[PDB]
A paper describes a structure:
Malonyl-coenzyme A decarboxylase (MCD) is found from bacteria to humans, has important roles in regulating fatty acid metabolism and food intake, and is an attractive target for drug discovery. Unexpectedly, the MCD catalytic domain is structurally homologous to those of the GCN5-related N-acetyltransferase superfamily, especially the curacin A polyketide synthase catalytic module, with a conserved His-Ser/Thr dyad important for catalysis.
We solved the structure of RpMCD by the selenomethionyl single-wavelength anomalous diffraction method and the structures of AvMCD and CmMCD by molecular replacement. RpMCD and AvMCD are also tetramers in solution, based on multiangle static light scattering studies (data not shown). Like HsMCD, the RpMCD and AvMCD tetramers are also dimer of dimers. However, the relative orientations of the dimers are substantially different.
Numbering used by the authors:
A (entry chain A), B (entry chain A), C (entry chain A), D (entry chain A): 35 to 144, 148 to 444
Write the structure that this text describes.
Amino acid sequence: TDIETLCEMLLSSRGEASGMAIAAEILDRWSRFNAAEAVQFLHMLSDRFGAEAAALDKAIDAYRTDKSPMAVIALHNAAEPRRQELLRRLNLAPNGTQKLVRMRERLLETRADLGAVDTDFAHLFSSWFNRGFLTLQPIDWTTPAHILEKIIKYEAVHEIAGWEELRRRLAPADRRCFAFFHPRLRDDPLVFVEVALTRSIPSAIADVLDESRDHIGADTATTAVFYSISNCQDGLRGISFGNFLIKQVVEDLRRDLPGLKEFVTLSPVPGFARWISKIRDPKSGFPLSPEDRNTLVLLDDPTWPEDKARADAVERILLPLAARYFITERTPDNRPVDPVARFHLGNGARLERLNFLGDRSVKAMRQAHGLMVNYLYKLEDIETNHEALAQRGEVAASPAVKALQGK
Amino acid sequence: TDIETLCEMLLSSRGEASGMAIAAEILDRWSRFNAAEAVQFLHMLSDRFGAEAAALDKAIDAYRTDKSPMAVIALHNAAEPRRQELLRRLNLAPNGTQKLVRMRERLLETRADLGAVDTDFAHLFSSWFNRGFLTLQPIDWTTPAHILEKIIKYEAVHEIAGWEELRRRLAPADRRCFAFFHPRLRDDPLVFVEVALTRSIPSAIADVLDESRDHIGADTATTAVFYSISNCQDGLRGISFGNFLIKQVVEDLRRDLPGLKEFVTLSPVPGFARWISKIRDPKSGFPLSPEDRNTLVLLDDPTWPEDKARADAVERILLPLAARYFITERTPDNRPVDPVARFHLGNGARLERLNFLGDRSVKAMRQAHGLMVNYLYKLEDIETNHEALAQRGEVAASPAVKALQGK
Amino acid sequence: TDIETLCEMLLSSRGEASGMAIAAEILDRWSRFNAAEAVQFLHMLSDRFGAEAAALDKAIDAYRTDKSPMAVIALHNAAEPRRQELLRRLNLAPNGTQKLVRMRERLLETRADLGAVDTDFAHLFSSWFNRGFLTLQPIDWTTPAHILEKIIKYEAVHEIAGWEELRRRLAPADRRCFAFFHPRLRDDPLVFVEVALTRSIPSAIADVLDESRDHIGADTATTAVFYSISNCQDGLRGISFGNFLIKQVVEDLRRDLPGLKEFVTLSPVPGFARWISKIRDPKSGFPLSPEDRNTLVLLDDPTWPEDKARADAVERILLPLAARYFITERTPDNRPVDPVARFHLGNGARLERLNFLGDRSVKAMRQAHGLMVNYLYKLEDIETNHEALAQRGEVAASPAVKALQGK
Amino acid sequence: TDIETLCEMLLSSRGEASGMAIAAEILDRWSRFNAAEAVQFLHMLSDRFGAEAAALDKAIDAYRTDKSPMAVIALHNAAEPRRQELLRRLNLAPNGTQKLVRMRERLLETRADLGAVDTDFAHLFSSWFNRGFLTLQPIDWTTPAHILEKIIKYEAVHEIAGWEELRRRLAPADRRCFAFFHPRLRDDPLVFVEVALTRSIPSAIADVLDESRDHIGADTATTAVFYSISNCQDGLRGISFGNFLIKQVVEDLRRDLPGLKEFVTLSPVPGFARWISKIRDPKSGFPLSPEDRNTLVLLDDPTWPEDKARADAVERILLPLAARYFITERTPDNRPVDPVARFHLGNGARLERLNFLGDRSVKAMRQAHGLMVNYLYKLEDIETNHEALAQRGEVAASPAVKALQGK
Ligand SMILES: [Cl-]
Ligand SMILES: [Cl-]
Ligand SMILES: [Cl-]
Ligand SMILES: [Cl-]
Ligand SMILES: [Cl-]
Ligand SMILES: [Cl-]
Ligand SMILES: [Cl-]
Ligand SMILES: [Cl-]
Ligand code: NI
Ligand code: NI
């Protein structure tokens, strides 16, 4: 109620240098709310805290005959929603940034007017969280526990059991892990990656995870394996930077361990099984031999081990199907169907090889029938590959992958 | 030459996450330049890196009939100069922020098209250097020397001799000093203030500075005296925050030393002598008794000590003249004539008293014939005072000051 | 083999400033060993690296007629075992201190000649780990995990389950914990204590531990409860300092939370059941009514809950028996029978009250049939109490405890 | 007065864990004193706080027939002065170590009974300041100023003018400097060295110091030059470790700049002129041609420049005289006459070459008529050289030095 006239004052408080209290209070009265209040705030925010159309037209006015840089400025200014300043001003409150981030979070949960009140959140987050203001910190058994526990929490890909499991892939000098931290938040990371230093390229995530694995000297390691990336902040969805993390990490590895020559990933590739469902539909208009269709009716039974021959016959038609998925199949906007593909590829990586039944975990079995792939991050091939994809519609794939071309 | 097509690529390098090299190089090829190059860069920046008018009209187009929030967005977007992204993207270069700050500096040194290429620098600096991202650090004999030396350098008001002088007002627990630091720069402060903890309110800066002064127990101190504020970053001219520093400091003093009851300033007030020149001009249209005019002909002689009576007779007509200066005289835009007045007053302070011949230093003798004033920062009186001034045209002055009203 | 002539060189390497390598190597060749080697080292250490009796007699010689301070020096010197320098010199090896500490550990595991080679370890540890060189660090959910895990490991009294349990008594601002750290070791603490801030004095450890407990505002806390102290370093057995930790902690609590008025402990008191066994033996020569003896035959059945009346009748004769244990029963050297008693009492604490069935845990049930006591750390009463005990044979007990005097 | 019975209590306060207050007070009542009090403390310290001869004889008693390790212990114990514990116990006082160090300082300023009360100070300082507990910290323009200023203060060899001078040899990446710090003191270093990274070996300190010098890329540096070592703590006189500092530094340079191949020193060598005085005395019994004696009468005139021929003729007989000084001349205890020689040589360095008129400064002109030498720290030649000297009486000198053998 009053917590909606407060803001009005946050914008009027010119060179006061006191609004911090305003910002503060507004942020705490927000701390407490209900799904029917937190919603009536994100509305009257867009319903009243937008661009003052009066001054804007007055501007499009002057512009009709004044197309000189000074006008485009007055225009660009009037065009700015008032809820943008409000945010900047709200940022002054103690830890106000984090509070504003969790706020854009409660928004993203929930009309089309909101899509507008969000773009502003994004516009500010895209600068406040400019990668130039983020420091890459190494995460290991040493880093404080209250933040380490958040790692267990945010592990999206290969969910981390409990603390002994966490230690397992964080303690050995066999392993290593890095996260991005912003000075304001600082106790909670933005994104992180887990790496495995090894003497080869894994095919099964199981290899990399089993404690019964054999540890190798950190420096006797020839290749680095990014086996799991994770975004921790949800209210930063869109303000992407994992795209950096890799580029950075690979380089800091170069320095510290010049013995590393390869930089791969043991990625997941979900929404592949989803695809398969679309293909099995005769209405797919997708080519399938009555014999093929008759072999994929095997996926509908959650059993692969039984009759190794069973999986064997599945493998025979899955990989090429996948290769096909990857190398060609695009979405209606013409992009690689898989979400993590658009990632590694959008970062100039290369589809190195397919790993049939790499996971075997329940999630991946349902996400994409156990499949897993390795993406490669070659030194020179990166801006070139990023081009093949970007504007053309090409996917950087190795001959081993292309090979399965038609089968 | 090529260092002007590079940028063009910095904007095309979408989800590449490699432009850092672009940013870098562009920033170093900039490192080296000439006043005839550094100028041909700040031009072709505004001459080509502005808003693409084609898409902007296409937008004012759709807006003529679409006044729904989603349109104002597309408008506000098209209205944005391309040199804005360029900056954000340039920020990625190692220490890119500092490099971009020293850049806006080389701009400010130097047509009206530049006034437009600067507003953008400002728009980004006003968010990047949002006070929420600045930490108040205490500065004393402990803080590292490479940064301490910058303090000697940037002391604007009461210029600091050499290191022994610096130590003098930095070493005693009699003294204290705070600065604002931004995480990126971090080794060079943005603004700082020097404080003197005491048992009274000074009138002469000389009192506060002489080593022969008598030191008092830090906690036996009753009042805090801000005797000198200074902005270190020139390329941040306009992105004001000293206005905060005080508000903060006073509070951290409250905590650490609850014995402090007053919070004053031993300020300078320049451009007062400048004013006096304007008044002595008969064409001023300003009231002056032939007797007054005949007493101010004493200022033209750089000697005050000689014949204490001389200064005495000057004092008699200067203070009230000053009181007048302060309490009423406004500029053509209707604001307090003095620059540091617009500061302390714009921060809800109060003109407590005038100090005739407080300085005696060459700068202040020429800046405002040795005068100096004390501004007060009372607890409750601050948002009220800030209002008296803000929208009305009133100046918070104590009865002791008002007293000189008419004389 | 050669790893026993190396040392010989460590003592000959005067102003070489190179023996670090000697120290190093000797410490690594030690790293690897066997119970039949690590023992043949701790022998030839005392069997050859002791005081050179030749020079010592030559000294007791000169002393027979020279009793001037300069002689007592030459004497005190000759009297010094060579294995003392060896240790000092061994300390130079990288992390050599920690390595020498784990070494005194392998000694303590294992004739009477060793009791001599140990005193030297002690003489050096008592100075190297002089409390003046130890810093009290606060331990909580923030402190790094690799060290936090050691806390779970070394919890001697109320063994800590797993990480969720650890968090439980480390996370709330309801709780708090401090440890002593020496600069060399630094990643592993020496001793630590767990405290519970509350509004009363606990009787059952169960109260303090159950998560279902009710948390109170840290500052709304009236009393502090030391519920568990633990020494982490075994090779520092004897170089006692937990005796400090308390004295320190209580004081830092005073500062940070002036609301704390009491400082108690919910201590264990083991070897009490052990005592009881000694009393039930008719040969004890200890007074016991045929009726008493007939009620303590109830302890031999591991069931207390069953027939609350059972425990009730046990309680009736246990507390006074205990009060007796405490207030009078001394050992053959005339000291309080309980080991943790000699602790809190030797630190001028006061036996405040007895807690029948405070623990109920298997260890305490066997250690001292569930009993638990609260010791008090009153401000003035401490050096006085420490005297009552020290040289006299008195135990600081409250009237509530004394009360059970004879029953 | 009472401040001499306090200590008596510091020794009686067994497991009190409260004596810190005793230690404290005793240390402050000491803080204040007079040369006639501070002396009456260092006396009644040795006059009453020494070994209790009663128990000592009781020990030499048991030893007459008991020569088993357990006896030598009781002996070594009784032989220990009580003022030794007192110190250990005094160390508990806040910053008690530093306070005890400045104390041994006031002692060293001032009978032969004191020589005994000091050995104990030394015995404890030699362990407390065991090199294993000292960390080598790099000192440069970054390190805090309150400690940097102490560097200006303690520069013994080439006295450092003021802060601009200090900066001069501390700021360039041309230069570098390291100091040893003990955790307790920590704000004041123990010993430090100044190094110059270069492309050759200097002969004149003047080369290394002049700002007009030409700076070279830190890594384009081929050799490291230790041009000045300094001990800061006087109360640690005897607890030598500069002997380490070099050994350490050279190694950390190896790592950071593998381009460094040589490690020399541009040392001073005082008490050389002193020697010369001894030789010019006919009573020296030292060979001197009437022609020699007649050329050294030139030193008595403080002018070298005048008639370059003058210095030229001095040079001709000085270097060989020096070579002689160095290579042979020993003291009555048979050691190298120069004090800094006994240093670099005692650290296995090599006399590489002599620098006639290297200094020219007033101190060196009087210390040793401008002469200066370079000592070499070759990799393998160090423990060998340290042996040549140690037990034999040989000095590691290069053929260039030996060459001047007889002239
Ligand atoms: Cl904050
Ligand atoms: Cl980084
Ligand atoms: Cl950076
Ligand atoms: Cl702050
Ligand atoms: Cl170490
Ligand atoms: Cl402490
Ligand atoms: Cl301390
Ligand atoms: Cl070190
Ligand atoms: Ni913007
Ligand atoms: Ni000793």
